């Protein structure tokens, strides 16, 4: 829960950009929103795909390393807290972030409108 | 007392051009992206054109892009647009609203403060379906307005605002559930996907007037139902 604010306030200090300057970027990711007792193997996925999705050498170059470091310790925090319909779902939403980023030629405004999208799905998926 | 105060409508024959102003006060109008909404007779709202704080960015509905052209000037807080090559489209009451997004969920699109518009008039997408047209209540009744969209609102992106005769619109909710500051609790939304509701649980005087919905999730342009009108018994 305080691990959960901790991770939303250093995706927030990651933005670059302005999404108002990306308007014309803004895509459909279609979450899975109504997925969140159970729900610990779906956070933990979800958990693993943000980490994922931040890890690659494209996020790195897009991202500040120093902020993206505080970022994977605290979603690490969460998974150690915590510590098969739903998992699909949620992987095909992370595919559709990648597909998207792709296409987008990982834009700083692709970028941007990724960042505001799991802002709004890490903290639906956490209450 | 914080408002808008637009200006500049008038009577403009086709082909003819107007400059229309919208001065702000209450509020440093610098740190807000700004937007031009019209309403025509008989017709749902209709976003026109918005504005960053800086003025560095700007956006257009198709239909009026290259025709009108949007500016602010920070020092002054004012916003304008200059409307061009007018047509019998054209004629409605223009609003200009003050953008309740901000950048940690960059969510804009959606209106916190409006004013109460400048009328022109010319000489001569997802669609929201709101149902009822007219709710006709007594003070002290139960309201259940709908909204519902012809594709899925991304992000649940979804507004109600209210329009009471002689007041700017108002917002109530935005995110479809959140009650903007200072809206009385029983205002609720509910929703998700392509059905959204506004709930009022106990209509007071000051709750007959004009219901509309509008979504936001969208690339622009962002779009609005054609209102619910709730009137007194």
């Not at chain 2, 002290?140 to 991304?154: F, H, I, K, M």
Request: aromatic residues 12%.
């Amino acid at each position: 829960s305080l691990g959960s604010r901790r991770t939303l306030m250093l995706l927030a200090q990651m933005r670059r950009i302005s999404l108002f300057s990306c308007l014309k970027d803004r895509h459909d990711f279609g979450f899975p929103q109504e997925e969140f007792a159970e729900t610990i193997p779906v956070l933990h996925e979800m958990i693993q795909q943000i980490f994922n999705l931040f890890s690659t050498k494209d996020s790195s170059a897009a991202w500040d390393e120093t902020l993206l470091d505080k970022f994977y310790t605290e979603l690490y925090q969460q998974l150690n807290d915590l510590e098969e319909d739903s998992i699909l779902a949620v992987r095909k939403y992370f595919q559709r972030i990648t597909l998207y980023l792709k296409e987008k030629k990982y834009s700083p405004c692709a970028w941007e409108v990724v960042r505001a999208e799991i802002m709004r799905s890490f903290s639906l998926s956490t209450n | 007392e914080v408002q808008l105060v637009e200006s500049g409508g008038d009577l403009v024959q086709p082909g003819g051009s107007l400059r229309l102003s919208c001065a702000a006060s209450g509020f440093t109008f610098s740190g807000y992206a700004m937007a031009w909404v019209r309403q025509a007779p008989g017709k749902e709202m209709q976003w026109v054109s918005s504005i960053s704080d800086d003025g560095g960015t700007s956006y257009y509905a198709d239909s009026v892009e290259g025709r009108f052209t949007v500016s602010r000037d920070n020092s002054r807080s004012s916003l304008y647009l200059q409307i061009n090559n007018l047509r019998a489209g054209d004629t409605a009451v223009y609003h200009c609203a003050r953008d309740h997004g901000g950048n940690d969920y960059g969510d804009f699109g959606h209106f916190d403060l409006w004013g109460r518009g400048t009328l022109v008039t010319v000489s001569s997408e997802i669609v929201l379906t709101q149902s009822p047209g007219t709710l006709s209540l007594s003070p002290g009744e139960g309201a259940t307005l709908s909204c519902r969209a012809s594709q899925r609102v991304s992000n649940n992106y979804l507004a109600w605002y209210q329009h009471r005769p002689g007041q700017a619109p108002r917002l109530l909710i935005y995110g479809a559930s959140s009650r903007a500051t200072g809206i009385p609790d029983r205002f609720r939304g509910s929703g998700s996907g392509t059905d959204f509701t506004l709930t009022i649980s106990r209509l007071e005087p000051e709750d007959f007037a004009v219901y509309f919905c509008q979504q936001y999730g969208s690339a622009p342009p962002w779009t609005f139902g054609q209102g619910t009108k709730v009137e007194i018994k």
